[PDB]
Each structure stands twice: as structure tokens, then as C-alpha cells.
Amino acid sequence: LHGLLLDQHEEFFIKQGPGLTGKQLRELQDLRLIEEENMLAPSLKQFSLRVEILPSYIPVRVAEKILFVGESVQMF
Amino acid sequence: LLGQGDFIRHLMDLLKPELVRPATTLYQHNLTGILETAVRATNAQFDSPEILKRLDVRLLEVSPGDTGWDVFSLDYHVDGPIATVFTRECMSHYLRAFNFLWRAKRVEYILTDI
Amino acid sequence: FILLKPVFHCLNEILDLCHSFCSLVSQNLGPLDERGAAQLSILVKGFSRQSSLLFKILSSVRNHQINSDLAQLLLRLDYNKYYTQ
Amino acid sequence: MPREIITLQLGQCGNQIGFEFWKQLCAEHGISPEGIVEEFATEGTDRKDVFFYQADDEHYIPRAVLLDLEPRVIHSILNSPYAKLYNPENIYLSEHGGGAGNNWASGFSQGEKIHEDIFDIIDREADGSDSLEGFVLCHSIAGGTGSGLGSYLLERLNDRYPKKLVQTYSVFPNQDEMSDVVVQPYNSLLTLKRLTQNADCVVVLDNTALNRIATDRLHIQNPSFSQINQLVSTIMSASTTTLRYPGYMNNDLIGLIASLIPTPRLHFLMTGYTPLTTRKTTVLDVMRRLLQPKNVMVSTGRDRQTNHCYIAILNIIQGEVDPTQVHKSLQRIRERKLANFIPWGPASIQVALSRKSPYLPSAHRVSGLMMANHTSISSLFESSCQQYDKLRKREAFLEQFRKEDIFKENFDELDRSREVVQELIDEYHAATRPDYISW
Amino acid sequence: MPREIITLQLGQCGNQIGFEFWKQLCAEHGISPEGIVEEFATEGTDRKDVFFYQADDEHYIPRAVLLDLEPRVIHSILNSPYAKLYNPENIYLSEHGGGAGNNWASGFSQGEKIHEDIFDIIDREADGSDSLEGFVLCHSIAGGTGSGLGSYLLERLNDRYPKKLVQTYSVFPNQDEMSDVVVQPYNSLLTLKRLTQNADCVVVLDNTALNRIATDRLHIQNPSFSQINQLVSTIMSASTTTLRYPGYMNNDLIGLIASLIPTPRLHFLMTGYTPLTTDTTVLDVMRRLLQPKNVMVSTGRDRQTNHCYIAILNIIQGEVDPTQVHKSLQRIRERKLANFIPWGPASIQVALSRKSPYLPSAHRVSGLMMANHTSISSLFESSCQQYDKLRKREAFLEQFRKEDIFKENFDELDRSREVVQELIDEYHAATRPDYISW
């Protein structure tokens, strides 16, 4: 609802964070990473998944969607 | 499976000019762009964008002692359940068949060009 | 064509040459002095070197990654191929 | 890329044939008379870009040129509902509607004089082609414009498009009818020398054979040029069938023509079409139906002494064909041994199974085009040579030739054409010999 | 700051050209004959402040002057519906309607006589212009007011605005017709010499080839001056299209001039306009303009002269796809349709533009072609030959001796001929691959 993850005792599984075709793709990716390292890589995500405390039953994709929702809630 | 052959003919006209070159000129970004342009020009433009995203190019082996018509190969990125519906042995068999077909097509296009 | 470091260095050399040539040309109004004559010779040499390295680098860049802009620009640049000569 | 073909229908006969063929092709592609593609044809798989130029309004402006030396035909075509289909910028009609007056010399003179306009329209069309395959010219050699202008056009097109293919529907004069122009033999000789030297294929359309076939198969009493043009339209749509229907193998006309004319000088092949009518033939049934010499649309002299052998035979059959029955029927036909081939090599018997155009409705479940190369046409060449020789030996119609620049000096151009035709006929007899390998 | 251009309409031909171009500009910017901006041009994207002054009543007053040595033309200009569009204070017409009688000497004398008036008008316009780049003079180098007024005005303007650009639209007379004034060749020579000495560029608009185009492509049997004027107005609107449409790059004419004349002497260009016919891909438009029959400039086609397009530019106005432009470049370059100067790479420029929103186009793609082709050296040789022929007979040199330009001698004509010869020689050196070293 708000991105609020209160962990005063760190009780959560979410931690507050911050083949030629393949060869061509790898070369393009290296060039793109070189481009991005310079002036890209913007402000890192305020949250992260504390997978050390992750629930063995919670799906990872579900956690990713929940992280997106929480980050969006915080950003909004 | 080398079906619609107008794209094959257009790609032959585009690549044989480049398949005369050796394998040391392995810059297939132009090849992928040529694939996209052929799709946009030949009657394969109606092919689904997902079908084009399944389509790919991968040169089988490196052989500068062989022109582009002997080291150039294609690739078919299958997705999800469809990829699980394409065995590696089946992939190898299809690759061998496509290689034979491409060799025959190269012979035929060579005859037409001659 | 931003991320290339060699592109950055070549652009630095070319831009310094362009700025220096513009400064020498605009500052001089009559006959160029011995500094101006050396500048004219150096500018001819630098422009030729920049053009040749540009042809080679454009070929290499169009070869390296997915950039048809380089190919189109080279097609426009080599129109009479005297620059390509 | 795509392989476009531009069709030029020249003169009265060529223009009328072009109009009829345009109607046939438009019906095959499902095109309205206003140039509007039908909603049912909006999902067609035909590579329309090759032969019809889809305008920005999706209007297929045919890559077709209408040429007429008499402004009457041009006016009639622009008066038809198909006037809007073709680009008016591609419509060239001479203000001097006098034509050549059935004289090749005047035809070539006018063709070279309008080479300005002719080449301008040619460039206007060619600059609009992406990877055009070639050009097709449909015209009648009996007209003066058709003969002399055809010669001039052959040379001038081998210049303006030296790298582009040259196919022609050379409407050959009726080999059975007495030509009203004795020098029409000389005009035809000039046009034929031009065909052999600057035209890539002489598709001789025998009007005598056309009349015979029309009166025989369609039961046409006093057939008008309308029905002949309809049959021509059918044949042309059959030739464009591979362009209309995208296929998988031998999709380029390079392969078909390579299977058709291995000999450079032997650039001429004969054709026939089915169904030709105003009983669904099976593979073998339709084969025998085309195999009937009464089904031949070419009046090649029936010289049994000339061992006319179908050096080539091609069945471009569109419709329901069973591949296993195809193998069986091919075996049966080879057992029938009903055809003769050039002894210098094996017999060319080509079979292509095609899918029909969804925009074209077919009364026959299977329609086939039979293209063959046989030495019997050399008899028709000998007949034409004899008629020309009789005109030369009589110095017939040489007054207007001397009034024309081509024969104002001499008819040595006619002599060279006759020598070239004699060389071609001799090569044809050498081909009738298995020794053509060394001919 | 806007770059104001002062439009000079000089002589009968120049005044007609100015009036027609003003009408074309008013239509393109939606300006009524009284100068009032049309409602459809209330949202016009043309930067009207550049070559016109928009009024406090939104009436476009082009920064143009219609000047005539004879009151007939001046009265007709103020009698046209477009009279109320222009500012009367900038219009100077000589009350002495004698003109120069197709004489550059008399025209220069009259220009010097009204140098106060002409220079004052120039200064008033510059003070009324924020960042006026220069003036464009559309007139003929052979008429009475035209030739001599152009020479004298070129001197006076090179004196008044040394740091401003000088543009002259030399409406060249038909070179195929025997001029009634043999000393009109001398007048043309004097105007050309003045252009070479005190003007930075003269755009030769060949009336002979313009009429040839009007007769051939426009089917104007005996094409009228009205027809040539309408074509000129269309070409002028094409030349001002980049001003009528606010652009993003190459929005300054400095680059246009620099690419037009890499050599300050080699400042003459040949023009083409499209559509040029009686009433679109980049490659198709290129080939259509490449049809040499679409050129309305009578530059001598000397087969001995290695004429090459030293500059080639296509100002394409209308719908062109950028990818289509790239493919067009590929196709045209493969065709090698243009011969460029051998001393360096070929200049083939493409400027995609949008039509002024107040201008409806019957043709989706229209173009302006600017080609600096060494075939003009033959036209220079023809002009030099005509000047030498008129001088050789000394015909009507008595009237020149009555005129100050030839009262002492015809040294001004000789200097003009020498300047033309020097230009033709530099052009031949340009046709030579030594042009880089020429």
C-alpha cells in the first residue's frame, strides 16, 4: 500500500537495499555495458530481496512482482 | 525448412556477394540486419514478429578455407514449451537436413546465377 | 557512437584540430605569418590524417557492432571517393 | 529481393493484347476497375509488388506501358473502365497517329525519334523498381511500328537496361495468311534480326495457328480479335502464375528459363495453354490433351523430314495433382515414348505443380501450360525466309523502303537480317542433327 | 536574433521578379495583398520576422523594396494589390523616368546619383532589422536601371555593409535572342565586374533556359514573362522554404553560403526547381531532377570542359522517409548520376523540409536544386565572347564615350572582361583535378 517495510527487528524476507548469434549478442552486450557504466546506472533500488530470510514456499517470481509493487509504491 | 523461397533467393543475392568472402569476415550483425530487411521486403513480412523472434542465425563452424556458403549457418530460437518440444537430437537432425537443403539450394542458386 | 573510448580520443584530436584551425583562421585576416604557414601545413596534414583514420575507424565500427548509421554516413561521405582516395 | 517485371503492350495488336492480359491478371489478383484491391483480396499471398505497383493507396498500378501508333487505341483504353488502373504518366501515345504504315523502316524511325519519350517513360518506370526481374514487350511485328520500333526498342533497351531481362510476345504474322505488305517480309526480317541480336526471346505468336486453334477447340466461327486477345490474356496470366502464386522451389524465372533455353542462339520456345475454352484432366489426361497436335497453338511447318524433336517440354500445371500418381504417370508417359528430344543430350521433360491464385476462379480443376522446343519451328523459319526471299527477288515494296532511311541507301540491312536468319535456320538444322554439339 | 534580408526588385525584370516573389511569399506565409496575415496563417510556423516585418496589426510587410528608374514600374508596383503589404517608406523610385536605356554606365551614374537615397534606404532598413544578414538583389544586368544600378549599388553596398552578406539574383537575359542593345553586353559585363569586385555572389538565372523550360516542360507556347515570373516566384519560395519552416539543424544561411562557395570567387551556382512541368522517394526525386531537361539554366555544355557538379543540393519539400532517403543515397550513388569536382569528395546534400502550412501543394514532393557544375565555365566563356564581340566592332561606343564609363575609354568593360576571363580560368582549373592545388 505504501512500500512500508518496517524491520525494527529485521523480521522480513525483504531487505532494504540501495553459437554465432550468441557471440554477436555477447559482443553487443559488452559494448552496451561499457556505454552504461559511464553515464547510465541510475539511483539504485531502495529495496532488495533478503533471500537469506526468504520463505521456502514463496515463489521467486511472486517475490519479484511484490518487490516491483513495493518499489512502485515507494516511488509514487 | 526452406519453405517460402523468395526470401531465400533475395538472401542469396545479398549473401553470395558476401559469401564470396572468407570466414574471417564473421560479422553477422549485417546478416541479422539483412534478415530483418528481407522480412520487411519479401513476402515474409507477414510472418509473426514472434516467428521472427524464433528465427535466428548461428554459423555452424568456422572455415576461412570455405566461403560464406560453407561456414554460414542459421539458428532457430524456440521458446518455452515449444523449446521443450524440440529435442537436441531432433535439433541436430533438423540441422543436418537444413544443411543438406542449404547446400542443394546453394547449388541451385549457383546454377541460376551461372 | 558515444561509449567508444577510441572514438572519444579520435574525436578529441579532431576537435582540438578544428578549434585550433578555426582560431588561426579567424585570428589571421591578412597574410599568415610563419606560424600561420606552419599552421596551414599542419592543418592540411591533420585533416588528411583525420580523414584517413576516419575511413579506417568507420569501417571498423560498421564491422564491430549493430550500427547502420555508420554505413549510411560512409555512403554519404565517400560520394566522389576522393575522400576515399 | 523481389523480381518485378514490366510489360509494354505496343502498337494496336500489342496494346489490345495488353489490355486483355491486364484484365486477366487483375481478375487473377482480385482487383477492381478503379485500381482498388478487393477486401477479399486484401489478404492475398501473391507477390503483387513484382508486376503490380501497389500505390500509397494500396492501388496496384500495373507495371504496364501502353504504346499505340494510332491514337484511337490509346483513347479507347483510356475510355475503358481500366483507364484508372494504369498510371497515366506511363501512358504514351504519339500525337502523330500515323504510325509507320506497316513499314519497319518508318517504325524504327519513329521509335528512335520517340526514344526520347520512350526512354523517359522507361526511366520513370525503372527508377520505381526495387529488384526488378525484367521487362516483357508484347507487340505485333506485322505493323511497321511493331517491326522497326521493335528492332529499335530491342537495341535501345539492351542499352538502357543492358542488365535487365528481355522477354517478348512477338505477335508473329499469320503464317497461313497472304501478307498484304510484300515488304512486310523485309520489315519482319529487320525485326527478326533485331530479335536475334538485341531481343532475348522471340515468342512467335502465329496468327494462323491462333485462328486454327480458336476455331477448333472453342468452336469460334469467324473469331474476332477479342477472343484471340482473351486467349492471349489467359496465356499471359499462366506465364505470370508463378509470380502470382508464391512457391517453394524454382521460385525464380532464372531456373525456368535455364530449363527452357540452354542454347543462346536457340532463344525461342513455343507455348500452349489450358484450359482454352469459351471433364477435369488428370495428370496423364491433361498431358495427353496437351500432347494432341490439334492442341498446338503454333503453326510450325509439319516437316516430317525435319525430325522435329521436342527438345524441351514443360508442364506448368496448377491444380490438384497427386505426387505419387505423378510419379506413376511420369513413368507411364516415359513408357509412352511419344516425344522426341535433341540427340545431343537427354530429353527435357519438366513438371511443376502449382497452387492457383485465390483471387482467380477456375472452371477446370487443373490448368496447364505446355512449353516446348522442337525443330519443327525451323520449318516456319524457312517459310518466312522463303517469303522474304521472294519479296527480295521481286524487289517488292522497295519504293517506300527507298523513301525510308533504312532502305534509302540500300536494303543491306535486310540482307544482313536474311543472312542472320539463314545462320539461325542452319543452326536449327544442326540442332536437328545430334552434331549440334560441334555446330 | 532574426536575420533580416532586404529584397531588391530592380529594373522591369527585377521589379516583376520581386512582385511575383512577394506574392509567393505572402501566399506561403498567409499574408494578404495588404500585408495582413491570413487566419489560416495565424498559426503559421514561418518565422515571418526574418524577411518581413509583421505589423502591430499582424500585417506582413516584406523587407522588400521595388525600385525603378522609370515611374511606370514603380506606379504599377504600388498599384498592385500587394502594394499595401510593403512599407512605402522603403520604396524609392526615380522621378526622372529616363532609366539608363539598357546601359550599365547610365545605370551606374543614376545609382550614384541616388546613392544618398539608396544608401539611406539601406541604412533605414538595417536600423529596422535586428540582425539583418544582408540583402538580395533580383534584377537584370542588362536593363537600364538593372545593369548600371546593380553595379553602382554593389559598390555602395560593399561600402555600407562590409560585414553583411551580399546576394544578387541576376535574372540573366535570354542569351539566345539578339539583344536590341549591343552595349547591353557591355552593361552585363560591367554588372558582372561589379559583382566580382564588390559582391559576394550572383545567382545567374538564365532567362534563355528558363524560357526553354517554360516552352518544353510547362508547354507555354511563346512563354510569357508572366510565366517566367511565376516560375521565379515558386523558386524564390523554395529558396526561402527553410525560413518559412522553422527547422532544427542548418537553420543558419552561413552554412548554405559556405557550402555554396568553397572558394569565395567560385560563388556562382545553377538552379533547378520542381515540380517543373505544366499542371515521392528520394531516389525517384533525384532521378527526376537528374533529367537534364528539368534544368532552366543555359550553362554552356562544353564537351571540352570537364563540367562536374562541384556542389549538388536537393532541398526536398514534402514526404520522404529517412530510411527511403538512405536507400535513395545508395541507389543514386550506385548510379553515379552526378560528376563531382575531382579535387575532393562529391558534395551531394539533401535537406528534407516541410511546406509552409499556409501553402497547399498539388504535388506532394517539390524540390529546389542547387548545383555548382563546371559547365557554367562555358557560359562564362560565352559571355566573354559576347563582350569581346561587342567591343571588337566598337559599335555604339560613341554613346559609351558620351557615358562616363566609356567617356575616357572602355577600361571598365576591359576590366569586366578580364575578371570574367580570370573566373573562367579558375573554373577550368576547377575542372582540372589540380583544383585543390589550383
- Determine the structural class of chain A based on helices, strands and strand pairing: mainly alpha
Helical fraction of chain A equals: 40-55%
Instruction: List how many beta strands of chain D DSSP finds.
Output: 12
Order of helices and strands of chain A: EHEH
Strand order of the largest sheet of chain A: 1-2
User: End-to-end distance of chain A, in Å?
Assistant: 10 Å
Helix content of chain D: 40-55%
Largest sheet: number of strands, sense, barrel closure of chain A: 2 strands, antiparallel
Order of helices and strands of chain D: EHHEEEHEHHEHEHEHHHHEHEHEEHHHH
- Total helices of chain A: the number is 2
In percent terms, what proportion of residues of chain A is strand? 5-15%
Outline of chain A, from the CA principal axes?
elongated
**C-alpha Rg of chain D, in Å?**
21 Å
The number of strands of chain A is 2
- What general form of chain D does the structure show? globular
Major sheet: arrangement of strands of chain D:
5-4-1-6-7-8
Multimeric state: part of a larger assembly
Largest interface: B-D, 18 and 17 residues
Family (chain D): Belongs to the tubulin family.
Keywords (chain D): Cytoplasm, Cytoskeleton, GTP-binding, Microtubule, Nucleotide-binding
Protein name (chain D): Tubulin gamma chain
GO biological process, one term (chain D): mitotic cell cycle
Itemize the secondary structure elements and their pairings.
This is part of a larger assembly, with two copies of chain A, one copy of chain B (114 residues) and two copies of chain D.
Chain A (H helix, E strand, L loop, with lengths): L13 E2 L4 H20 L8 E2 L10 H16 L1
Antiparallel strand pairs in A: 1-2
Chain B lengths: L5 H14 L9 H13 L7 H6 E3 L10 H4 L2 E3 L3 H5 L3 H26 L1
Helix pairs in contact in B: 1-2
Chain D lengths: L4 E6 H19 L18 H4 E3 L5 E3 L1 E5 L2 H9 L11 E3 L10 H10 L1 H12 L7 E7 L3 H17 L4 E7 L12 H15 L4 E2 L2 H11 L7 H15 L1 H4 L8 H8 L9 E4 L9 H9 L20 E8 L3 H14 L11 E7 L11 E8 L3 H17 L4 H6 L1 H5 L2 H21 L7
Parallel strand pairs in D: 1-4, 1-6, 4-5, 6-7, 7-8, 10-11
Antiparallel strand pairs in D: 2-3, 9-12, 10-12
Helix pairs in contact in D: 1-9, 4-5, 4-6, 5-6, 6-7, 7-14, 7-17, 14-17
Subcellular location (chain A): Cytoplasm, Cytoskeleton, Microtubule organizing center, Centrosome
Protein name (chain A): Gamma-tubulin complex component
Family (chain A): Belongs to the TUBGCP family.
